């Protein structure tokens, strides 16, 4: 019989008050606290903390504080990852990001969600849907990436865009709900 | 013969530079500073601080740092209140929230506003309009709730929604300005 | 024969990893760290730190922590400047703001941008376009102001608005992409 963690990772309904999940969120918040307190010149300390926090990385990555996440271990980024100030990644399920990603400030990436149904939501059970972002993606500042979304290679998300569905490779999308506004290839 | 505080709470034009109001904002920011500095495992200290800061609460509530507000005492939340990372509540007038509220990260709830007219606005005088949120409401991350809005029981605010008008009970709204996208239950 | 800083300020492609630019960014973050750590009652220290950080100011200005910026010296504000909690100003190029500005919380002002082509963007070279904001402007909470935008005197930006083009004087804009929704006269 599946644990709440197994249920969470599998995209099934789970209880976030589970003791194992609580311990793991406290661990993520501890590492995030240490991260957000580092000085602007402590690059090596920052790299080390991020490689410890995330599930996987490439050689190089840089994130401006403040940063926020749920678990840490569900975040997998490619080479030369960059995220500007005040980002939030709710990584209840996997968040997999490709190489040479540029993410602007105040960007929120969500895998966490609730049942829409009033009665179901009030159970207090939640679930997640993974987010996949390809290579050479630019996510404009203040964008919102919703659970279950896949963004294709070379795509561009306009600043302030609320992305509610998959974004094709080589597309620029913007607005809310975001839609294709330009093709690059 | 009304004080600036009395005019503020009544929804009339008032001067925020008023000494009494300045002191109360200083007090809110002090409690918010103490709150934001608490460690991820300091649940009891957090509960205590929020109960001191807010006008009223139910038995249990939890907010992820960072949190910001203006006064504290104008915020009234129901049972099992949860607000995720980096929320802002500008509580110049009352913000009343029902039970079992789930609020995502980076959500802003405003009761503070200015005159549209330039001379009127440069008077420097401001005003407020209260916000009322019902029971079993889910406010998606990065939503904006404007002054004067009432959100009905069971409603869902999509991530990134900018809510400019009342939301019926059992409706799902999304967009900017938010509109009804479906009905529930 | 131009330095990366000279290309940056002139709106040309530049490399942010330039040693001079890195030094200058570290200075800005240092001063921003000192600013964000100030207590709610340290008004004089706050005023001094902002006049050090910014390119130019009027007599009086106040920003609620947290604040973020890239360089500081490209930010020029007019008399009686106010910015609420959790603002971000990416001042790769000049951000010039007039007198009596009220900026709500969580507002993002960008001058930094990337090429749309992924090979061109993957060069890692970036560029900037200045933002100009007139006098007596109200920027609603959670607005996003994109590079190259000019906002006219007495304009009002609705909360949550994503401003992708110039805003006429005496106009109210709202939405994403923002459009004029009311003329003030």
Coordinates of C-alpha atoms in Angstrom, one line a residue:
Chain A
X1 CA 0.0 0.0 0.0
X2 CA 1.5 3.3 -1.2
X3 CA 2.9 6.0 1.1
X4 CA 1.7 9.6 0.7
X5 CA 5.1 10.4 -0.8
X6 CA 4.6 7.7 -3.4
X7 CA 1.1 8.9 -4.1
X8 CA 2.4 12.5 -4.5
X9 CA 5.1 11.6 -6.9
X10 CA 2.8 9.5 -9.0
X11 CA 0.3 12.3 -9.5
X12 CA -2.4 10.7 -7.2
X13 CA -4.3 12.4 -4.4
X14 CA -2.1 12.6 -1.2
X15 CA -2.1 14.2 2.2
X16 CA 0.7 16.8 2.5
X17 CA 0.5 16.5 6.3
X18 CA 2.2 13.1 6.1
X19 CA 5.2 13.0 8.5
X20 CA 7.7 12.0 5.8
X21 CA 6.6 14.8 3.5
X22 CA 6.7 17.3 6.3
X23 CA 10.3 16.4 7.2
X24 CA 11.3 16.7 3.5
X25 CA 9.6 20.2 3.2
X26 CA 11.4 21.3 6.4
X27 CA 14.7 20.1 4.8
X28 CA 14.0 22.1 1.6
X29 CA 13.1 25.2 3.6
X30 CA 16.3 24.9 5.7
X31 CA 18.5 24.8 2.6
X32 CA 16.5 27.6 1.0
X33 CA 16.9 29.8 4.1
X34 CA 20.7 29.2 4.0
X35 CA 20.6 30.0 0.3
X36 CA 18.6 33.3 0.6
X37 CA 21.0 34.5 3.4
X38 CA 24.2 34.0 1.3
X39 CA 26.0 37.2 0.2
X40 CA 26.0 38.5 -3.4
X41 CA 29.7 37.4 -3.6
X42 CA 29.4 33.9 -2.2
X43 CA 29.0 32.2 -5.6
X44 CA 30.7 28.9 -4.7
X45 CA 28.5 28.6 -1.5
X46 CA 25.5 29.3 -3.7
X47 CA 26.4 26.6 -6.3
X48 CA 27.0 24.0 -3.5
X49 CA 23.6 24.7 -1.8
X50 CA 21.7 24.5 -5.0
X51 CA 23.3 21.2 -6.1
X52 CA 22.4 19.9 -2.7
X53 CA 18.8 21.2 -2.8
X54 CA 17.9 20.2 -6.4
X55 CA 17.5 16.7 -7.8
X56 CA 20.0 17.3 -10.6
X57 CA 21.9 20.1 -12.3
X58 CA 24.6 20.7 -15.0
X59 CA 28.0 22.2 -14.2
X60 CA 26.8 25.8 -13.7
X61 CA 23.7 27.5 -12.4
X62 CA 22.9 30.8 -10.7
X63 CA 19.7 32.0 -8.9
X64 CA 19.1 35.4 -7.4
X65 CA 17.5 35.4 -3.9
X66 CA 15.0 35.1 -2.8
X67 CA 14.1 31.7 -4.1
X68 CA 11.3 29.3 -2.8
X69 CA 10.6 25.6 -3.4
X70 CA 8.6 22.8 -1.9
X71 CA 10.9 19.7 -2.0
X72 CA 14.0 20.6 -3.9
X73 CA 14.7 17.0 -5.1
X74 CA 12.0 17.2 -7.8
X75 CA 13.8 20.1 -9.6
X76 CA 16.2 19.0 -12.4
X77 CA 17.9 21.8 -14.5
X78 CA 20.2 21.6 -17.5
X79 CA 23.5 23.4 -18.2
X80 CA 23.9 27.1 -17.5
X81 CA 20.6 27.5 -15.7
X82 CA 19.7 31.1 -14.7
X83 CA 16.7 32.3 -12.6
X84 CA 16.3 36.0 -11.6
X85 CA 15.1 37.5 -8.3
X86 CA 12.1 36.2 -6.3
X87 CA 11.2 32.9 -8.1
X88 CA 9.0 30.2 -6.8
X89 CA 8.9 26.6 -7.9
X90 CA 6.3 24.3 -6.3
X91 CA 7.9 21.0 -7.0
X92 CA 5.4 18.5 -5.7
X93 CA 5.9 16.7 -8.9
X94 CA 9.0 16.8 -11.2
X95 CA 10.1 20.1 -12.7
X96 CA 12.5 19.2 -15.5
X97 CA 14.3 22.1 -17.3
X98 CA 16.7 21.9 -20.3
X99 CA 19.9 23.7 -21.1
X100 CA 20.5 27.5 -21.4
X101 CA 17.2 28.4 -19.7
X102 CA 16.8 32.1 -18.8
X103 CA 14.1 32.8 -16.3
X104 CA 13.2 36.4 -15.4
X105 CA 12.3 37.7 -11.9
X106 CA 9.1 36.8 -10.0
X107 CA 8.5 33.7 -12.1
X108 CA 6.2 31.1 -10.6
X109 CA 6.4 27.5 -11.8
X110 CA 3.7 25.2 -10.3
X111 CA 3.2 21.5 -10.2
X112 CA 0.9 21.6 -7.1
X113 CA -2.9 21.7 -7.5
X114 CA -6.3 21.0 -5.8
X115 CA -9.5 19.4 -6.9
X116 CA -11.9 21.9 -8.4
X117 CA -14.9 20.2 -6.9
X118 CA -15.8 21.9 -3.6
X119 CA -16.3 18.7 -1.7
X120 CA -13.2 17.0 -3.1
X121 CA -11.0 20.1 -2.4
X122 CA -12.3 20.2 1.2
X123 CA -11.0 16.7 1.8
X124 CA -7.6 18.5 2.2
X125 CA -6.1 16.0 -0.3
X126 CA -4.0 17.5 -3.1
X127 CA -2.1 16.3 -6.1
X128 CA 0.5 17.4 -8.7
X129 CA 1.2 17.4 -12.4
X130 CA 4.8 17.6 -13.7
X131 CA 6.2 20.6 -15.7
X132 CA 8.7 20.0 -18.6
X133 CA 10.6 22.9 -20.1
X134 CA 12.9 22.2 -23.2
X135 CA 16.3 23.6 -24.2
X136 CA 17.1 27.3 -25.1
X137 CA 13.8 28.5 -23.4
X138 CA 13.4 32.1 -22.2
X139 CA 10.7 32.6 -19.6
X140 CA 9.9 36.4 -19.3
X141 CA 9.7 37.9 -15.8
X142 CA 6.4 37.5 -13.8
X143 CA 5.3 34.5 -16.0
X144 CA 3.2 31.7 -14.4
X145 CA 3.7 28.1 -15.6
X146 CA 0.8 25.9 -14.6
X147 CA 0.9 22.2 -13.6
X148 CA 1.1 19.7 -16.4
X149 CA 2.6 22.1 -18.9
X150 CA 5.3 21.2 -21.4
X151 CA 7.3 24.0 -23.1
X152 CA 9.1 23.0 -26.3
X153 CA 12.7 23.8 -27.3
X154 CA 13.5 27.4 -28.2
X155 CA 10.1 28.7 -27.0
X156 CA 9.7 32.2 -25.5
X157 CA 7.2 33.0 -22.8
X158 CA 6.4 36.8 -22.8
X159 CA 6.7 38.7 -19.4
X160 CA 3.5 38.3 -17.4
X161 CA 2.2 35.4 -19.5
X162 CA 0.0 32.8 -17.7
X163 CA 0.7 29.5 -19.4
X164 CA -2.2 27.1 -19.1
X165 CA -1.3 24.6 -21.7
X166 CA 1.6 23.1 -23.7
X167 CA 3.7 25.6 -25.7
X168 CA 5.1 24.4 -29.0
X169 CA 8.8 24.4 -29.8
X170 CA 9.8 27.7 -31.5
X171 CA 6.7 29.6 -30.4
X172 CA 6.4 32.9 -28.6
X173 CA 3.4 33.0 -26.3
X174 CA 1.9 35.8 -24.2
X175 CA -1.2 37.0 -22.4
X176 CA -3.5 35.2 -20.0
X177 CA -4.3 32.6 -20.8
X178 CA -1.2 32.7 -23.0
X179 CA -1.5 32.0 -26.7
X180 CA 0.9 31.9 -29.6
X181 CA 1.8 35.5 -30.7
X182 CA 4.8 34.8 -33.0
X183 CA 6.6 31.8 -34.6
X184 CA 10.5 31.7 -34.6
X185 CA 10.9 28.8 -37.0
Chain B
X1 CA -14.7 65.4 14.0
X2 CA -13.5 62.1 12.6
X3 CA -9.8 60.9 13.0
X4 CA -7.9 59.8 10.0
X5 CA -8.1 56.2 11.3
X6 CA -11.9 56.5 11.5
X7 CA -12.2 57.9 8.0
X8 CA -9.8 55.1 6.8
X9 CA -11.9 52.3 8.2
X10 CA -15.1 53.9 7.0
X11 CA -14.0 54.0 3.4
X12 CA -13.6 57.8 3.2
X13 CA -10.6 59.8 2.0
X14 CA -7.9 59.9 4.7
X15 CA -4.2 60.9 5.1
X16 CA -1.9 57.9 5.7
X17 CA 0.7 60.2 7.2
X18 CA -1.5 60.6 10.3
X19 CA 0.6 59.9 13.4
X20 CA -1.8 57.3 14.9
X21 CA -1.9 55.4 11.5
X22 CA 2.0 55.6 11.1
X23 CA 2.4 54.0 14.6
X24 CA 0.0 51.2 13.8
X25 CA 1.8 50.5 10.5
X26 CA 5.1 50.4 12.4
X27 CA 3.6 47.9 14.8
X28 CA 2.3 45.7 11.9
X29 CA 5.8 45.7 10.2
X30 CA 7.5 44.8 13.5
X31 CA 5.3 41.8 14.0
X32 CA 5.7 40.9 10.2
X33 CA 9.6 41.2 10.6
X34 CA 9.4 38.8 13.6
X35 CA 7.2 36.5 11.6
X36 CA 9.4 36.4 8.5
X37 CA 12.5 35.6 10.6
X38 CA 11.0 32.5 12.2
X39 CA 12.6 29.2 11.3
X40 CA 10.7 26.6 9.2
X41 CA 10.1 24.5 12.4
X42 CA 8.9 27.3 14.6
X43 CA 5.2 26.4 14.1
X44 CA 4.0 27.5 17.6
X45 CA 5.9 30.8 17.5
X46 CA 4.4 31.5 14.0
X47 CA 0.8 30.7 15.2
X48 CA 1.3 33.0 18.2
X49 CA 2.6 35.9 16.1
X50 CA -0.2 35.7 13.5
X51 CA -2.9 35.6 16.1
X52 CA -1.3 38.7 17.6
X53 CA -1.0 40.4 14.2
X54 CA -4.5 39.6 12.7
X55 CA -7.9 40.9 13.9
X56 CA -9.2 37.4 14.3
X57 CA -8.4 33.7 13.3
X58 CA -9.8 30.3 13.8
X59 CA -8.0 27.5 15.7
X60 CA -5.3 26.8 13.1
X61 CA -3.5 28.8 10.4
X62 CA -0.2 28.7 8.5
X63 CA 1.5 31.2 6.2
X64 CA 4.8 30.7 4.4
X65 CA 7.2 33.6 4.7
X66 CA 7.5 36.1 3.4
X67 CA 4.2 37.7 4.3
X68 CA 3.4 41.5 4.2
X69 CA 0.4 43.6 5.4
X70 CA -0.4 47.1 6.3
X71 CA -2.2 47.0 9.7
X72 CA -2.8 43.4 10.7
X73 CA -5.9 44.1 12.8
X74 CA -8.1 44.4 9.6
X75 CA -7.4 40.8 8.6
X76 CA -10.0 38.2 9.8
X77 CA -9.5 34.6 8.7
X78 CA -11.6 31.4 9.3
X79 CA -10.6 27.9 10.3
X80 CA -7.7 26.1 8.7
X81 CA -6.3 29.1 6.8
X82 CA -3.3 28.5 4.6
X83 CA -1.4 31.1 2.5
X84 CA 1.7 30.1 0.5
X85 CA 5.0 32.0 -0.1
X86 CA 5.3 35.7 -0.6
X87 CA 1.7 36.9 -0.1
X88 CA 0.7 40.6 0.3
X89 CA -2.5 41.8 2.0
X90 CA -3.0 45.6 2.0
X91 CA -5.6 45.8 4.8
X92 CA -6.5 49.5 4.9
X93 CA -10.1 48.3 5.2
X94 CA -11.3 44.9 6.4
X95 CA -10.2 41.7 4.7
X96 CA -12.6 38.9 5.8
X97 CA -11.8 35.3 4.7
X98 CA -14.0 32.2 5.5
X99 CA -13.0 28.7 6.5
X100 CA -10.7 26.2 4.7
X101 CA -9.1 28.9 2.4
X102 CA -6.2 27.8 0.3
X103 CA -4.2 30.7 -1.1
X104 CA -1.3 30.1 -3.5
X105 CA 2.1 31.8 -3.5
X106 CA 2.6 35.4 -4.6
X107 CA -1.0 36.3 -4.1
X108 CA -1.9 40.0 -3.5
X109 CA -5.2 41.1 -1.9
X110 CA -5.7 44.9 -1.9
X111 CA -8.2 47.1 -0.1
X112 CA -6.0 50.2 -0.6
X113 CA -6.8 52.5 -3.6
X114 CA -6.3 56.2 -4.9
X115 CA -8.4 58.7 -6.8
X116 CA -8.1 58.3 -10.6
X117 CA -7.9 62.1 -11.0
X118 CA -4.4 63.5 -10.9
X119 CA -5.1 66.5 -8.6
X120 CA -7.3 64.3 -6.4
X121 CA -4.5 61.7 -6.2
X122 CA -1.8 64.3 -5.5
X123 CA -3.9 65.6 -2.7
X124 CA -2.1 62.6 -1.3
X125 CA -5.3 61.4 0.2
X126 CA -6.3 57.8 -0.2
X127 CA -9.1 55.4 0.6
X128 CA -10.1 51.8 0.9
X129 CA -12.8 49.3 0.0
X130 CA -13.1 46.0 1.9
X131 CA -12.6 42.5 0.5
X132 CA -14.8 39.5 1.5
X133 CA -13.8 35.9 0.6
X134 CA -16.3 33.1 1.5
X135 CA -15.8 29.5 2.7
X136 CA -13.9 26.7 0.8
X137 CA -12.4 29.2 -1.6
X138 CA -9.2 28.4 -3.5
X139 CA -7.1 31.4 -4.7
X140 CA -4.6 30.2 -7.3
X141 CA -1.0 31.5 -7.0
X142 CA -0.2 35.0 -8.4
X143 CA -3.8 36.0 -8.4
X144 CA -4.6 39.7 -7.6
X145 CA -7.8 40.5 -5.7
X146 CA -8.9 44.2 -6.1
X147 CA -10.5 46.5 -3.5
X148 CA -14.3 46.0 -2.9
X149 CA -14.4 42.5 -4.4
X150 CA -16.6 39.8 -2.8
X151 CA -15.8 36.1 -3.6
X152 CA -18.7 33.6 -3.0
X153 CA -18.4 30.3 -1.2
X154 CA -16.7 27.4 -3.0
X155 CA -15.3 29.7 -5.7
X156 CA -11.9 29.1 -7.5
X157 CA -9.6 31.9 -8.7
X158 CA -7.3 30.5 -11.5
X159 CA -3.6 31.1 -11.0
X160 CA -2.6 34.6 -12.3
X161 CA -6.2 35.8 -12.4
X162 CA -6.8 39.6 -11.9
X163 CA -10.1 39.8 -10.1
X164 CA -11.8 43.2 -10.7
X165 CA -15.4 42.4 -9.8
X166 CA -17.4 40.1 -7.5
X167 CA -17.0 36.4 -8.1
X168 CA -20.2 34.3 -7.7
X169 CA -20.3 31.3 -5.3
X170 CA -19.4 28.0 -7.1
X171 CA -17.8 29.9 -10.1
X172 CA -14.3 29.4 -11.5
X173 CA -12.8 32.6 -12.8
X174 CA -9.5 33.3 -14.7
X175 CA -7.9 35.9 -16.9
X176 CA -7.3 39.6 -16.6
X177 CA -9.8 41.0 -16.0
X178 CA -11.0 37.7 -14.6
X179 CA -14.2 36.2 -16.1
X180 CA -16.2 33.1 -15.3
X181 CA -14.7 30.1 -17.1
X182 CA -16.8 27.4 -15.6
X183 CA -19.3 26.5 -12.8
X184 CA -19.1 24.0 -10.0
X185 CA -21.0 21.7 -7.7
Chain C
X1 CA 36.3 49.9 -29.1
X2 CA 33.5 50.1 -26.6
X3 CA 33.4 48.4 -23.2
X4 CA 30.5 46.1 -22.4
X5 CA 29.2 48.8 -20.0
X6 CA 29.1 51.4 -22.8
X7 CA 27.3 49.0 -25.2
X8 CA 24.9 48.1 -22.4
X9 CA 23.9 51.7 -21.7
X10 CA 23.6 52.5 -25.4
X11 CA 21.2 49.7 -26.1
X12 CA 23.6 47.4 -27.9
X13 CA 24.3 43.7 -27.4
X14 CA 26.6 43.3 -24.4
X15 CA 28.0 40.6 -22.2
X16 CA 26.8 40.8 -18.5
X17 CA 29.7 38.7 -17.4
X18 CA 32.1 41.6 -18.1
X19 CA 34.2 42.2 -15.0
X20 CA 33.2 45.9 -14.6
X21 CA 29.5 45.1 -14.9
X22 CA 29.8 42.2 -12.4
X23 CA 31.6 44.5 -9.9
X24 CA 28.8 47.1 -10.3
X25 CA 26.0 44.5 -9.9
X26 CA 27.7 43.3 -6.7
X27 CA 27.7 46.9 -5.4
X28 CA 24.0 47.3 -6.1
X29 CA 23.2 44.0 -4.3
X30 CA 25.3 45.0 -1.3
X31 CA 23.4 48.3 -0.9
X32 CA 20.1 46.5 -1.5
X33 CA 21.0 43.9 1.2
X34 CA 21.7 46.7 3.7
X35 CA 18.4 48.4 2.6
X36 CA 16.3 45.2 3.0
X37 CA 17.7 44.6 6.5
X38 CA 16.7 48.1 7.8
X39 CA 14.0 48.2 10.5
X40 CA 10.6 49.8 9.8
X41 CA 11.6 52.8 11.9
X42 CA 15.0 53.6 10.3
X43 CA 13.7 56.2 7.8
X44 CA 16.8 58.3 7.7
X45 CA 19.1 55.3 7.1
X46 CA 16.6 54.2 4.3
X47 CA 16.7 57.6 2.6
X48 CA 20.5 57.7 2.7
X49 CA 20.9 54.2 1.3
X50 CA 18.5 54.9 -1.6
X51 CA 20.1 58.2 -2.5
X52 CA 23.5 56.3 -2.6
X53 CA 22.0 53.4 -4.7
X54 CA 19.9 55.4 -7.2
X55 CA 21.3 57.7 -10.0
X56 CA 19.2 60.6 -8.7
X57 CA 16.2 61.3 -6.5
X58 CA 14.2 64.3 -5.1
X59 CA 14.1 65.3 -1.5
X60 CA 11.9 62.6 -0.2
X61 CA 11.4 58.9 -1.2
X62 CA 10.4 55.7 0.5
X63 CA 10.4 52.1 -0.6
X64 CA 9.0 49.2 1.5
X65 CA 11.4 46.2 1.6
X66 CA 11.9 44.0 -0.2
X67 CA 13.3 45.9 -3.2
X68 CA 15.6 44.6 -6.0
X69 CA 17.5 46.2 -8.8
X70 CA 20.4 45.4 -11.1
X71 CA 22.7 48.5 -11.0
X72 CA 21.0 51.3 -9.0
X73 CA 22.7 54.1 -10.9
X74 CA 20.3 53.9 -13.8
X75 CA 17.3 54.6 -11.6
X76 CA 16.3 58.3 -11.5
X77 CA 13.2 59.2 -9.5
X78 CA 11.3 62.5 -9.0
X79 CA 9.9 64.2 -5.9
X80 CA 8.0 62.2 -3.2
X81 CA 8.6 58.8 -4.7
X82 CA 6.8 55.8 -3.2
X83 CA 7.1 52.1 -3.9
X84 CA 5.3 49.4 -2.0
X85 CA 6.5 46.0 -0.9
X86 CA 8.5 43.6 -3.0
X87 CA 9.3 45.6 -6.1
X88 CA 11.9 44.8 -8.8
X89 CA 13.5 47.2 -11.2
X90 CA 15.9 45.7 -13.8
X91 CA 17.8 48.8 -14.6
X92 CA 20.2 47.7 -17.3
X93 CA 19.2 50.9 -19.1
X94 CA 17.8 54.1 -17.6
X95 CA 14.6 54.0 -15.7
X96 CA 13.4 57.6 -15.3
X97 CA 10.4 58.3 -13.1
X98 CA 8.7 61.7 -12.5
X99 CA 7.3 63.4 -9.4
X100 CA 4.6 62.0 -7.1
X101 CA 4.7 58.4 -8.3
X102 CA 2.8 55.9 -6.3
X103 CA 3.9 52.3 -7.2
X104 CA 1.9 49.4 -5.6
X105 CA 3.4 46.2 -4.3
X106 CA 5.0 43.4 -6.3
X107 CA 5.5 45.8 -9.3
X108 CA 8.2 44.9 -11.9
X109 CA 9.8 47.4 -14.2
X110 CA 12.1 45.9 -16.8
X111 CA 14.7 47.4 -19.2
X112 CA 16.6 44.0 -19.7
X113 CA 15.8 41.8 -22.7
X114 CA 17.2 39.0 -24.9
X115 CA 17.2 38.2 -28.6
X116 CA 14.3 36.1 -29.7
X117 CA 16.5 33.7 -31.9
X118 CA 17.8 30.9 -29.7
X119 CA 21.3 30.9 -31.4
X120 CA 21.3 34.7 -30.9
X121 CA 20.0 34.3 -27.4
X122 CA 22.4 31.5 -26.6
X123 CA 25.3 33.8 -27.4
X124 CA 24.5 34.9 -23.8
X125 CA 24.6 38.5 -25.1
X126 CA 21.7 40.7 -23.9
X127 CA 20.6 44.3 -24.4
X128 CA 18.3 46.9 -22.8
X129 CA 15.7 49.5 -23.6
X130 CA 15.0 52.4 -21.3
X131 CA 11.7 53.0 -19.5
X132 CA 10.3 56.5 -18.9
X133 CA 7.5 57.3 -16.5
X134 CA 5.9 60.8 -16.4
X135 CA 4.7 62.8 -13.5
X136 CA 1.7 62.1 -11.3
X137 CA 1.6 58.4 -12.4
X138 CA -0.1 55.6 -10.4
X139 CA 1.3 52.1 -11.1
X140 CA -1.1 49.6 -9.6
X141 CA 0.1 46.6 -7.6
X142 CA 1.6 43.7 -9.5
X143 CA 1.8 45.6 -12.8
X144 CA 4.6 44.7 -15.2
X145 CA 6.3 47.5 -17.3
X146 CA 8.3 46.1 -20.3
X147 CA 11.5 47.5 -21.9
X148 CA 11.2 50.6 -24.1
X149 CA 7.9 51.7 -22.6
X150 CA 7.1 55.4 -22.0
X151 CA 4.1 56.2 -19.7
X152 CA 2.6 59.8 -20.0
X153 CA 1.9 62.2 -17.3
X154 CA -1.1 61.5 -15.1
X155 CA -1.5 57.9 -16.4
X156 CA -2.9 55.1 -14.2
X157 CA -1.8 51.5 -14.7
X158 CA -4.5 49.1 -13.3
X159 CA -3.3 46.5 -10.8
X160 CA -2.0 43.4 -12.7
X161 CA -1.7 45.2 -16.0
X162 CA 1.1 44.0 -18.4
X163 CA 2.3 47.0 -20.3
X164 CA 3.9 46.2 -23.6
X165 CA 3.6 49.5 -25.3
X166 CA 3.5 53.3 -24.6
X167 CA 0.8 54.6 -22.4
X168 CA -0.7 58.0 -23.4
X169 CA -0.8 60.8 -20.8
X170 CA -4.2 61.0 -18.9
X171 CA -5.1 57.4 -19.7
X172 CA -5.9 54.4 -17.6
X173 CA -4.6 51.1 -19.0
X174 CA -5.5 47.6 -17.9
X175 CA -5.2 44.0 -19.0
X176 CA -2.6 41.7 -20.5
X177 CA -1.5 43.0 -23.0
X178 CA -2.7 46.3 -21.4
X179 CA -4.9 48.6 -23.4
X180 CA -6.4 52.0 -22.6
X181 CA -9.7 51.4 -20.8
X182 CA -10.6 55.0 -19.8
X183 CA -9.5 58.5 -20.7
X184 CA -9.0 61.0 -17.8
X185 CA -9.3 64.0 -20.1

